Amino acid sequence: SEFKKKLFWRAVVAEFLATTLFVFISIGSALGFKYPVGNNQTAVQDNVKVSLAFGLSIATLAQSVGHISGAHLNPAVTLGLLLSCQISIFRALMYIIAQCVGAIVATAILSGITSSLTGNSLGRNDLADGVNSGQGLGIEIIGTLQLVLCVLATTDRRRRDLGGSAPLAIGLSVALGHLLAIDYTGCGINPARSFGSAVITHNFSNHWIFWVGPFIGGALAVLIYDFILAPRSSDLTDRVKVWTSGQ
Amino acid sequence: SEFKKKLFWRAVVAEFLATTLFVFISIGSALGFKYPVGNNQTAVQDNVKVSLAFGLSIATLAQSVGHISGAHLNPAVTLGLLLSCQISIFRALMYIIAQCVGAIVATAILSGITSSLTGNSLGRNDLADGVNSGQGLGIEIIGTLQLVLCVLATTDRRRRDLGGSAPLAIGLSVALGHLLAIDYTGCGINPARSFGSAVITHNFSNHWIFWVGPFIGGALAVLIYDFILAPRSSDLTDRVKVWTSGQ
Amino acid sequence: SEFKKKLFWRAVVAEFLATTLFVFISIGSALGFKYPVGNNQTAVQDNVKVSLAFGLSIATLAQSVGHISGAHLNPAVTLGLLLSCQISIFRALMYIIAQCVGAIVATAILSGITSSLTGNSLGRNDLADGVNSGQGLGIEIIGTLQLVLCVLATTDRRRRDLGGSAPLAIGLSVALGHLLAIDYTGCGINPARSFGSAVITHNFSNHWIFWVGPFIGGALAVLIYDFILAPRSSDLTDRVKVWTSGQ
Amino acid sequence: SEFKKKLFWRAVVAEFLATTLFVFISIGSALGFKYPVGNNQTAVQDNVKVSLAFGLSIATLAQSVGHISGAHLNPAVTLGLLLSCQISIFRALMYIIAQCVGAIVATAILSGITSSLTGNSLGRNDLADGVNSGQGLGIEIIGTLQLVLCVLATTDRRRRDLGGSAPLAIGLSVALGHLLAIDYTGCGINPARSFGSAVITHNFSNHWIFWVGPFIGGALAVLIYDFILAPRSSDLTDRVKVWTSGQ
Ligand SMILES: CC(C)CCC[C@@H](C)[C@H]1CC[C@H]2[C@@H]3CC=C4C[C@@H](O)CC[C@]4(C)[C@H]3CC[C@]12C
Ligand SMILES: CC(C)CCC[C@@H](C)[C@H]1CC[C@H]2[C@@H]3CC=C4C[C@@H](O)CC[C@]4(C)[C@H]3CC[C@]12C
Ligand SMILES: CC(C)CCC[C@@H](C)[C@H]1CC[C@H]2[C@@H]3CC=C4C[C@@H](O)CC[C@]4(C)[C@H]3CC[C@]12C
Ligand SMILES: CC(C)CCC[C@@H](C)[C@H]1CC[C@H]2[C@@H]3CC=C4C[C@@H](O)CC[C@]4(C)[C@H]3CC[C@]12C
């Protein structure tokens, strides 16, 4: 079905390109404070800068390509939309592949651009000292839960009260996730974004957190929105058809 | 009446869950600068980070659940809407109970997540040194007054000039309250948010400020908007019916 | 005419109250970094914090009272609207009186709240070292020019392309003015806001800058918008009638 | 054609004036942290402050003059719109001349205002230490690519899903570009803005980067949007007519 339609593959390519741009811009901002290189200074990360980088990247790329693909740019968001039966299983798989590959490409280009930084961590996500696996998992779950809940509400399509920029809302939710999580885990909140850094650095220590936590958060957001707060008056069996149809 | 309608209890549950998420995200951001734990650094709170955390949390959760409950997430806002006769007394009581319980639950989960921080104040609100009870009370009154005034104006329903995102407006008002009050009192501006920290820490010193000041601010905002700036052409006796009817 | 209409005086009172709230919130934010008092720390002003305080105060108060008065809260903006013949001379005079009195009241209340700060400058505007009168005047002129130009464009009423929140646009313009001018002059950009601090501190040194520069900026913005970029197809004599009529 | 129409020349003058204001405000913000002059302090640039200065300047000036000219204020954006055949070749040339001259005028006025700063670099763009020409070129290409892509999408005119403020979207994209690029290259992304500083300082070292990279980014954004993601159902030959007709 969608496999043979130009619009579907345009959406897949848009997801790939937008994820590449998002990862590159955001992680390049995160690495920015390490320059100048020679200057021996106790330069400290600016958390507001990084959070705004991620959030405004999401907002800008949503404004740019959401009408083409929905501007997921996040495997957790795609999983939320899959479980809320808004996209097909095939579209979800292709979107997640595109997001991961785009994150890998962005992080490789970034490692090329930032070659002067010694021991460049490439914005890899890991637990901060004093934060164990369960605590970082909880932080990741909550950040992804709020992001996916915002996405599910913003695109409900039963709503007539919405006003303003939906891309700005999603970008601000991403910025909020980062403001919460940068100090604890680096704020994965986006399994593809963490995967790119882990792959390029050849370091997967504690990496399962940044896949499991965001997916748990997305699943909980779907549960909360679709079955507790704003249920639909549609038989589940009918909604299941979207998985193999995309309609 | 509303006690037996599924929509009402969905709104109550939405208020509980959204208050939990808001408190957790915001206070976790506020505690973030204390990590890493072992690193002996004179790390200093970033006030813009915390203010944006609170404000963007409110904006995101409003976008997510406002159509379900109105997204009060603040006992002072609920009291403002009660005194402006927009909600019933029962809905106000249930909303405030839900907000307090959600704040308690969020702060307990956070105390679990941040166990590595010694003497974790859990973002408890107290007067800064050089600020006595009356001065902090004034700061709290003004912050809550502007927040409640913005909420009352944004939802006037007599207005045809409104544009953009109402959730963003309310979140930005919350961020403004924090930008004002973090240095003086920690910016309660939200009696449930202060109550959760006070309950979890078992410390209620100067806690009456963070209930009285926000309620005085809400009452003053109601007085200003409903009886000075934008009066309604409706007999007060009719508006009183909403308290026992919710209509 | 308007002298005997309840709506006009409601607008005047709204301008007074909103200017009071704006000045109090913003200058209280600006003074915040001096707390705690006893703590001997080389605490440094956060310019982003103060700029956002001013801008978001303007945005919130515009959302709250613009439909009641237009939410000028700035004598320079009122002068711009007077010279573009949108308000009457009487309304401009009453608005500017209300703005100045509200700024005075806010700064007095703030001086009460911040009594623990020794030598409290109360956010008074003055030239920074290395900035002479002409240079600060230029900074003030440009900041007020951009603010007044944004206000004139946002309320053109010939425009069908506008989208989003006009209050947010004006608040962001104010934030921009502060981001530019805080380091040079303290960013008056609002003669009433500077007047309140000057009156309460009993210090008027270089105060003429913060009245002249903003008025020059407003006049230049009116010239640019109304006579270079977006002229109206109306005889000037007809527009002059608004001064004595307000229509 | 347009050469003899008052609207076209009003648009050109608007581009000149708005570019002047944008450059002045933004670079004056960037130079702000060097004041006070006498105070010997290890004052450090605030990257969030500068990024917001640039972005909010673009947002405010877009709101003010976009309906008059489209508020390009950036030769790279004008080139993107030229290659997407939305403007004529003549309008593009006049706009770029106006933008460059406005940047020069703004930087000259700023050098006058900031005369107390010794060795005033006037916000000139150059490569940071550890960043060679190719790496800075890549940063510039990506920043301009995201900006131009956002502009092309926001003004597609085939879109019915857009909501909120387009000026705010473009300003936030500019802020994102700065958050990415300030630490690497000083954040050009606007060849006129870099040209003004280079001309006033009489320093053109590595200046070709800040013309080539932004134009490559704009060209790639046009390619991506117009030929990969959102193609138009119009013969290229017809679109070429706009270059000599502006229609
Ligand atoms: C979207 C694309 C076109 C933007 C980036 C393209 C160009 C400018 C970038 C991408 C990868 C970069 C290269 C990556 C790695 C290095 C190795 C280093 O020892 C010298 C510079 C060099 C050789 C870089 C030069 C600039 C470069 C070629
Ligand atoms: C919304 C929910 C599901 C997210 C948080 C859930 C999980 C990941 C969190 C919540 C409470 C957390 C626990 C709270 C307290 C402690 C005690 C400490 O000495 C070891 C870790 C441990 C045992 C935490 C592990 C992680 C934890 C179990
Ligand atoms: C909008 C209004 C109601 C909010 C502020 C009202 C109250 C809480 C404020 C306003 C002015 C304040 C007073 C101003 C000055 C001082 C003198 C100082 O040595 C002790 C505290 C004291 C006496 C303050 C106590 C608190 C105060 C009374
Ligand atoms: C848009 C315009 C009107 C705003 C700026 C205009 C005025 C206030 C500015 C622009 C250029 C400025 C001058 C530029 C250079 C210097 C040289 C210095 O040694 C003394 C101050 C002096 C002489 C400045 C005084 C103030 C000034 C005249």
| CB neighbours of residue C165 within 10 Å | 27
Residues 6+ apart with CB under 8 A from D149: A21, A64, D221, D224, D225
Task: Work out whether the CA dihedral C135, C137, C143, C149 comes out positive or negative.
Answer: negative
Contacting subunits of C (3+ beta carbon pairs below 8 A): A, B, D
Pocket mutation for ligand 1, best pick of A16, A20, A37, A109 (most atoms within 8 Å of C-beta): A109
Q: Flag if D146 and A61 touch (Cβ within 8 Å).
A: yes
Q: Which of D48, D128, D161 comes nearest A36 by C-beta?
A: D128
The rounded distance, in Å, linking the Cα atoms of B133 and B185 is: 10
Residue contacts between C and D (CB atoms, under 8 Å): 129
Tell the residue nearest (CA) to atom 19 of ligand 4: D115
**Ligand 1 pocket check for D139: Cβ under 6 Å:** no
Q: Flag if B131 and C48 touch (Cβ within 8 Å).
A: no
Pocket mutation for ligand 4, best pick of D17, D37, D105, D115 (most atoms within 8 Å of C-beta): D115
Q: Flag if B159 and C66 touch (Cβ within 8 Å).
A: no
- C-alpha C136 to ligand 4 mean position (Å): 9
The DSSP letter of residue B164 is: S
| CB neighbours of residue B200 within 10 Å | 22
Q: Are D62 and C217 in contact (CB under 8 A)?
A: no
Among the bound ligands, the one closest to the CA of B143: 3
CA D137 to chain centre: 16
The rounded distance, in Å, linking the Cα atoms of B79 and B97 is: 12
SS3 sequence, chain D? CHHHCHHHHHHHHHHHHHHHHHHHHHHHHHCHHHCCCCCCCCCCCCHHHHHHHHHHHHHHHHHHHHHHHCCCCCHHHHHHHHHCCCCCHHHHHHHHHHHHHHHHHHHHHHHHHCCCCCCCCCCCCCCCCCCCHHHHHHHHHHHHHHHHHHHHHHCCCCCCCCCCCHHHHHHHHHHHHHHHHHHHHCCCCCHHHHHHHHHHHCCCCCCCHHHHHHHHHHHHHHHHHHHHHCCCCCCHHHHHHHHHHCC
**Ligand 1 pocket check for D138: Cβ under 6 Å:** yes
Question: Chain D: nearest CA to B163, how far in angstroms?
Answer: 8
Q: Flag if D164 and A162 touch (Cβ within 8 Å).
A: no
Nearest to D142 by CA among A25, A56, A60: A25
Per-residue b or e along D206-217, where b marks 16 or more CB atoms closer than 10 Å to that residue's CB: bbebbbebbbbb
The rounded distance, in Å, linking the Cα atoms of B236 and C105 is: 32
Question: Chain D: nearest CA to B165, how far in angstroms?
Answer: 8
Question: Chain B: nearest CA to D147, how far in angstroms?
Answer: 22
**Ligand 1 pocket check for D63: Cβ under 6 Å:** no
**Ligand 2 pocket check for A155: Cβ under 6 Å:** no
The rounded distance, in Å, linking the Cα atoms of A124 and A116 is: 17
Closest alpha carbon within chain A to B67: A161
**Ligand 3 pocket check for B137: Cβ under 6 Å:** yes
**Contact residues on chain C for B142, CB-CB shorter than 8 A:** 21, 24-25, 28
The rounded distance, in Å, linking the Cα atoms of B117 and B132 is: 28
Question: Chain B: nearest CA to C31, how far in angstroms?
Answer: 9
Interface test with A, best of D180, D182, D224, D225 (most A CBs within 10 A): D180
- C-alpha D106 to ligand 4 mean position (Å): 12
SS3 sequence, B72-84? CCCHHHHHHHHHC
Experimental technique used to determine this entry: cryo-EM
What fold does the segment set B7-230 form as a domain? Glycerol uptake facilitator protein (1.20.1080)
**Ligand 1 nearest-atom number relative to CA D135:** 26
The rounded distance, in Å, linking the Cα atoms of C76 and C215 is: 5
Q: Flag if D32 and C183 touch (Cβ within 8 Å).
A: yes
Q: Are C217 and C141 in contact (CB under 8 A)?
A: yes
Interface test with B, best of A50, A183, A222, A228 (most B CBs within 10 A): A183
**Contact residues on chain B for A182, CB-CB shorter than 8 A:** 32
> What is each CA distance from B174 to A35, A48, B57, B168, D118, in whole angstroms?
35, 17, 9, 10, 42
Rounded (10°) angle between helices B6-30 and A133-154:
130
Nearest to A99 by CA among A171, A19, A196: A19
The DSSP letter of residue C201 is: H
- C-alpha C113 to ligand 3 mean position (Å): 6
Would you state the structure tokens that stand for residue A58, as one six-digit string?
């999401």
- C-alpha A21 to ligand 1 mean position (Å): 15
- C-alpha B195 to ligand 2 mean position (Å): 22
**Contact residues on chain D for A64, CB-CB shorter than 8 A:** 146, 149-150, 152-153, 225
Among the bound ligands, the one closest to the CA of B28: 2
For C33, phi then psi, to 5°, come to: -70, -10
Nearest to B181 by CA among B228, B231, B217: B217
The secondary structure of C147-160 as a DSSP string is: HHHHHHHHT-SS-S
Among the bound ligands, the one closest to the CA of C139: 4
Tell the residue nearest (CA) to atom 22 of ligand 3: C112
| CB neighbours of residue D119 within 10 Å | 5
Peptide bond preceding A75 in cis form (omega within 30 of 0)? no
SS3 sequence, B21-89? HHHHHHHHHHCHHHCCCCCCCCCCCCHHHHHHHHHHHHHHHHHHHHHHHCCCCCHHHHHHHHHCCCCCH
**Ligand 2 pocket check for A134: Cβ under 6 Å:** yes
The secondary structure of chain A as a DSSP string is: -GGG-HHHHHHHHHHHHHHHHHHHHHHHHHTGGG-SSS--------HHHHHHHHHHHHHHHHHHHHHHH----SHHHHHHHHHTTSS-HHHHHHHHHHHHHHHHHHHHHHHHHTTTSTT--TT---PPTT--HHHHHHHHHHHHHHHHHHHHHHT-SS-S---S-HHHHHHHHHHHHHHHHHHHH----SHHHHHHHHHHHT--TTTTHHHHHHHHHHHHHHHHIIIIIS--SS-HHHHHHHHHH--
Would you state the structure tokens that stand for residue A29, as one six-digit string?
């901002």
Residue contacts between A and C (CB atoms, under 8 Å): 4
- C-alpha D32 to ligand 4 mean position (Å): 17
> What is each CA distance from C228 to B13, C159, D24, D100, in whole angstroms?
56, 17, 20, 20
Closest alpha carbon within chain A to C162: A164
Among the bound ligands, the one closest to the CA of A21: 1
Would you state the structure tokens that stand for residue A108, as one six-digit string?
């490789």
Question: Chain B: nearest CA to C21, how far in angstroms?
Answer: 8
Q: Flag if C165 and A164 touch (Cβ within 8 Å).
A: yes
The DSSP letter of residue C234 is: S
Q: Are D193 and D103 in contact (CB under 8 A)?
A: yes
Pocket mutation for ligand 4, best pick of C131, C135, C139, C149 (most atoms within 8 Å of C-beta): C135
Nearest to A177 by CA among A208, A207, A150, A216: A150
CA D119 to chain centre: 25
**Collapsing DSSP states into helix, strand and coil, what is residue C203?**
coil
The secondary structure of C110-134 as a DSSP string is: HHHHTTTSTT--TT---PPTT--HH
**Ligand 3 nearest-atom number relative to CA B132:** 21
Would you state the structure tokens that stand for residue C133, as one six-digit string?
């009168």
**Collapsing DSSP states into helix, strand and coil, what is residue B108?**
helix
Q: Which of B57, B67, B113 comes nearest A161 by C-beta?
A: B67
CA A93 to chain centre: 15
> What is each CA distance from D67 to A233, B198, C225, in whole angstroms?
44, 53, 12
Q: Which of A21, A35, A53 comes nearest D179 by C-beta?
A: A53
Q: Give resolution in angstroms.
A: 2.4
Question: Chain A: nearest CA to D209, how far in angstroms?
Answer: 15
The rounded distance, in Å, linking the Cα atoms of D20 and D13 is: 11
Interface test with C, best of B33, B44, B152, B229 (most C CBs within 10 A): B229
The rounded distance, in Å, linking the Cα atoms of A56 and D145 is: 15
Sequence letter at residue D233: S
Find tokens 């690497």 and name the residue: D184
Among the bound ligands, the one closest to the CA of A138: 2
Q: Flag if D25 and C176 touch (Cβ within 8 Å).
A: yes
Nearest to A228 by CA among B243, B20, B245: B20
